[PDB]
RNA sequence: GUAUGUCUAAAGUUAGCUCUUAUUUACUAACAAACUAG
RNA sequence: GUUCGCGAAGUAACCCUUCGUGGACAUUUGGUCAAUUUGAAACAAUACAGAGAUGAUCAGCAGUUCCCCUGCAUAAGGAUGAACCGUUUUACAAAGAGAUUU
């Protein structure tokens, strides 16, 4: 169910600065412009981090202009978030420049239905969105299924061939894709765009996954046995002998793993 | 030609030279103190004149 | 959450002040840590835009204002007032400005008043310290000798202006000679007329020479060793004068 | 002075705290009073 | 005098250089705006452009707007709007940095920000601690293109070209260092000269070397330190002090 | 062989014993008879 | 500039136009921000080494930190991410014995 009391919008929360204008463009040059600005904003998030060697073509295909070191390949790595803006770019702007290569007047309509409908069903081999986020893959097959109804309602008396443009359901498929991760993209981009301009929090602080049940559950044993020590001792204040006495309970457990007695002269 | 400083490893590294390497200076208390910070003061910079002429 | 120590003269002579809060703005120009930032106008019409260049706790550490940088109280100079508590307890206090990073924090996230900052604090001894700063104050070319260190270069150019009616110059310090230099002919009979005559600037006399010689500073010494020299056979020649 | 505080609309794609960054600090614990700690009150050991 | 006339264009929008700096790496770095991969050869050059202050002074629409913070560009000599710049155009003289006297300590005379304290190169905008006049002129090696001169003629020339740009306290360039140590009446003037002397020659067109103006790397005007030597710090003693008994005079008047 | 670490003036801050000499043994080598790293 | 009201001229002209006048409509933007060094990004270029237990070769997980980086991240990775090893003297006494100054 949705919120209901979601009147903030996005863009309805854009108008109402004084920055955003209004204005009328054809959906070309929007189109065009949200490829260059796209391109600008990758190629300055590319290049605050100091990643000048890769050098972002006009396609969004990332290219490390030469080969690496290590430190040039963990810089040059990126998560999901970057890659996914890259890939959805180049989703984009394949959409965009079907439409210019119609518009200049080379291909025709039908032609550019037909590219249309290409993008929209090859977006798992013309792009690359399939790597970085794969969830990607349901709307891809379904997407494939799309088409595998389509071919066969658009050519009943054709038989085999391109020329089928009817993109409708696969653009849907890809609409209802964006819907699901504006939100998503827009927590992991604030996240990356704070740890550029704001940096990293400081106190990270690490949950106990499966690999430090061990280690910290080492930690929680040996501080309760050595908050039972100091409590049990008498007025004795810890220098050196606090790190020691532990040493007795380790051995004791190593004595305990080998089922030798553990028997330590003096011990109270 | 003075002594290199060592590099600044990261951002905000301290150098121990400068300042106070963070100033502690105790609590206020309820005896009268200027008498002898003039005392510390003197001798303090006549130690730094004889490691000017001796070290 | 503190308003702003914002004193009378970086306001202005205006009632209604329309300033701008952003909250945490930019980090402070002396512990670099981010605060409240309030930028204004002077007028409504001002050309410059003034903004608390300082938080609130730095303002309260030398307790100075955050856009004119000077003292809450008094409008001065924290390096100033801290020399006149010199003058005034015989202690010198010095506002300790530290010079490391985590030093900057350290010493701004502390609750102490810093520096002379706790003598101007409060009214009563800043009253007290007042009258005793009152009690303090009731206890065509030419050449140029005798010019101590202590006399500026434009000094020489604004009494030799005064007296005239308004021409550069030349002065080796380490020599402890003065020249003058210009291209007017009627200018240098007009130097004549309002007089080896003697300028007195402060009570500190130059005597004056008509040096027919084309000076440059190779004329006052070429080395720094000359100068010197050419200084102490100055003084002595001055005593043969005297 | 009496002023009236206006908050400005700030740029949405900005950083909305350009101050705010990632910074480790010291923090001095003052001591304003002192604290009594108060303990009224060999071989086996 | 400046007052009568209007300020002149030094320079056209497209008789500027471009911002892309000169090409010291591979490729151009668009965030940061400078070169990678690779650091071999100066970023550091001889500026193009001079002030020449008695003929491009003038009044601009800053004395019509009122405001008095200098122009960075005209002191670079770089102003692309002559007598349209929202900023001042000329010397600062006795009355604008009398008028700069609520913000010059917070502010330098061309709306930078001063810093806590100096970079450790010494050099840049400066600080709202010292009432800092003397500035360092250094590299006077490429500002003469490594020509051997007397250093009585190199201070001649230093005099003269820091004459232009307001009143002179004392300069005194040290012979066994290569290097001028130039004090000013006013903070503003300090500030303006380090701005006006940035990185441009100090090659007269005199001389045969005039066509090869910029090739090596010009001046080095920075702020200098205290003058270390007991005498220059007697004499800052009791300057400072004479003041100090002027602002005595100024706070028992005013309460 | 990597990770990774370290060095690198263009810019000038003011006054019995001592010994030569060879054999042996031990640890190391992306050094040799197209490729292998945490 | 638009409109409302009035006066004066063309003009002994209730048509129209001009000139002059009072009112109304309309009322204080933008800047934390200046265009190549000198208010600070880091990598790369040179040269050498080339990994924590010890006899070798290593998987690690941790901890402290006024070290951070890549990461969407509270996951994960960064050589077990790096520095860790370095100096090292007084909450200091009591008993007993002899050799010394008075
Ligand atoms: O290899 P097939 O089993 O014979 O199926 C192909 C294949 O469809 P699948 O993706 O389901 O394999 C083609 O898709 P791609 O090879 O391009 O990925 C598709 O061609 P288009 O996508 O270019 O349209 C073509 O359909 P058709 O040739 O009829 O246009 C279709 O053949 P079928 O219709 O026999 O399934
Ligand atoms: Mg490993
Ligand atoms: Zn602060
Ligand atoms: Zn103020
Ligand atoms: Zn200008």
């Known amino acids: 169910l949705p919120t209901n009391h979601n009147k903030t919008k996005l863009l309805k929360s854009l108008k109402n600065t004084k920055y955003f204008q209004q204005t009328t463009i054809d959906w070309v040059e929007a189109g065009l412009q949200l490829c260059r600005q796209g391109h600008n904003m990758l190629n300055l998030l590319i290049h605050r981090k100091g990643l000048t060697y890769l050098h972002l073509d006009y396609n969004f295909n990332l290219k490390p202009t030469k080969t690496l070191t290590t430190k040039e390949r963990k810089k040059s790595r990126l998560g999901n978030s970057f890659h996914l803006m890259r890939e959805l770019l180049k989703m984009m702007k394949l959409i965009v420049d079907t439409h210019v290569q119609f518009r200049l007047g080379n291909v025709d309509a039908f032609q550019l239905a037909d590219g249309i409908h290409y993008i929209l069903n090859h977006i798992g081999q013309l792009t690359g969105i399939y790597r970085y986020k794969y969830k990607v893959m349901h709307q891809i097959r379904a ?126 | 030609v003075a002594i290199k400083k060592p590099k600044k490893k990261y951002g905000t590294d301290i150098d121990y030279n400068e300042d106070i390497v963070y100033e502690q200076a105790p609590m206020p208390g309820i005896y009268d103190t200027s008498t002898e910070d003039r005392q510390i003061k003197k001798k303090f910079e006549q130690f730094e004149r004889k490691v000017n002429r001796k070290g | 959450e503190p308003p702003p120590n914002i004193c009378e003269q970086c306001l202005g002579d205006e009632a209604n002040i329309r300033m701008t809060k952003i909250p ?54 924290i390096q100033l007032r ?90 080796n310090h380490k020599a402890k000679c003065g020249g003058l230099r210009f291209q007017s002919s009627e200018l240098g009979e007009r ?50 004068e005297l | 002075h009496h002023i009236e505080v206006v908050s400005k609309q700030m740029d949405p794609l900005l950083p909305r705290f350009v101050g705010k960054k990632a910074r480790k600090v010291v923090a001095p614990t003052e001591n304003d009073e002192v604290v009594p700690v108060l303990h009224m009150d060999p071989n086996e050991w | 005098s400046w007052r009568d006339k209007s300020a002149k264009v030094q320079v056209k929008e497209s008789e500027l250089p471009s911002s892309i700096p000169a090409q010291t790496g591979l490729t151009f770095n668009i965030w940061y705006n400078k070169w990678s991969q690779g650091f071999a050869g100066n970023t550091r050059f001889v500026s193009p452009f001079a002030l020449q202050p008695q003929l491009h002074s003038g009044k601009t629409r800053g004395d019509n707007d009122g405001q008095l913070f200098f122009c960075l560009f005209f002191a ?52 709202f601690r010292k009432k800092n006049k003397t500035l360092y002129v250094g590299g006077i090696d490429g500002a003469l293109n490594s020509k051997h001169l007397k250093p009585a003629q190199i201070e001649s020339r230093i005099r003269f070209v820091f004459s232009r740009l307001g009143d002179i306290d004392r300069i005194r360039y040290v012979e066994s260092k290569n290097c001028g140590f130039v004090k000013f009446k006013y903070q503003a003037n300090a500030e303006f000269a380090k701005e006006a002397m940035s990185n441009q020659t100090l090659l007269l067109p005199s001389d045969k070397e005039w066509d090869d103006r910029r090739e090596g790397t010009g001046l080095l005007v920075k702020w200098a330190n205290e003058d270390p030597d007991p005498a220059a710090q007697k004499r800052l003693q009791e300057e400072l002090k004479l003041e100090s008994l002027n602002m005595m005079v100024h706070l028992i008047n005013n309460n």
Not at chain 3, 117 to 125: F, G, H, K, V
Not at chain 3, 146 to 160: C, G, L, Q, R, Y
């Open chain 1, 143 to 268: 997407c494939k299924d799309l088409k595998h109804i389509i071919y066969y309602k658009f050519n009943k008396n054709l038989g085999k061939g391109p020329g089928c443009g009817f993109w409708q359901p696969a653009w849907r498929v890809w609409l209802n894709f964006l819907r699901g991760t504006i939100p998503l993209l827009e927590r992991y981009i604030g996240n990356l765009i704070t740890r550029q301009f704001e940096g990293r929090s400081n106190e990270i602080v690490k949950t106990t996954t499966k690999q430090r049940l061990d280690a910290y559950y080492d930690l929680e044993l040996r501080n309760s046995v050595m908050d039972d020590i100091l409590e049990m001792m008498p007025e004795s204040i810890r220098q050196k002998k606090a790190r020691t006495i532990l040493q007795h309970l380790s051995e004791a457990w190593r004595c305990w793993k080998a089922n030798i007695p553990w028997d330590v002269p003096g011990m109270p």
């Open chain 3, 24 to 77: 945490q703005g930019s980090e402070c120009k002396i512990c670099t840590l981010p605060f409240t930032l309030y930028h204004f106008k002077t007028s409504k019409r001002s050309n410059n835009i003034i903004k608390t260049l300082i938080c609130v706790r730095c303002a309260t550490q030398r307790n100075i204002c955050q856009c004119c940088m000077l003292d809450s109280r008094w409008h001065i100079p």
């Open chain 3, 82 to 171: 801290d020399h006149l508590i010199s003058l005034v307890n015989e202690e010198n206090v010095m506002t300790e400005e530290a010079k490391n990073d985590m030093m900057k924090r350290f010493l701004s996230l502390k609750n102490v008043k810093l520096g002379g900052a706790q003598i101007t604090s409060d009214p009563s001894e800043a009253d007290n310290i007042v009258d005793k700063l009152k009690n303090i104050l009731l206890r065509k070319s030419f050449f140029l000798y005798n010019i101590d260190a202590s006399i500026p270069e434009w000094k020489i150019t604004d009494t030799v202006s005064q007296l005239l009616g308004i021409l550069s110059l030349i002065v």
């Open chain 3, 191 to 240: 130097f004549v007329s309002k007089i080896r005559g003697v300028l007195l600037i402060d009570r500190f006399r130059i005597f004056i020479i008509p040096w027919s010689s084309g000076f440059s500073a190779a004329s006052f010494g070429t080395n720094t060793a000359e100068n010197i020299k050419l200084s102490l056979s100055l003084n002595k020649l001055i005593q043969l």
């Open chain 5, 76 to 127: 670079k000599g770089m102003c692309c709007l002559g007598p349209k710049c929202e900023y001042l155009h000329h010397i600062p003289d006795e009355e604008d940095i009398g008028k700069l006297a609520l913000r010059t300590e917070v502010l330098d005379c061309f709306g930078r920000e001063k810093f806590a304290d100096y970079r450790e190169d010494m050099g840049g905008i400066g600080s």
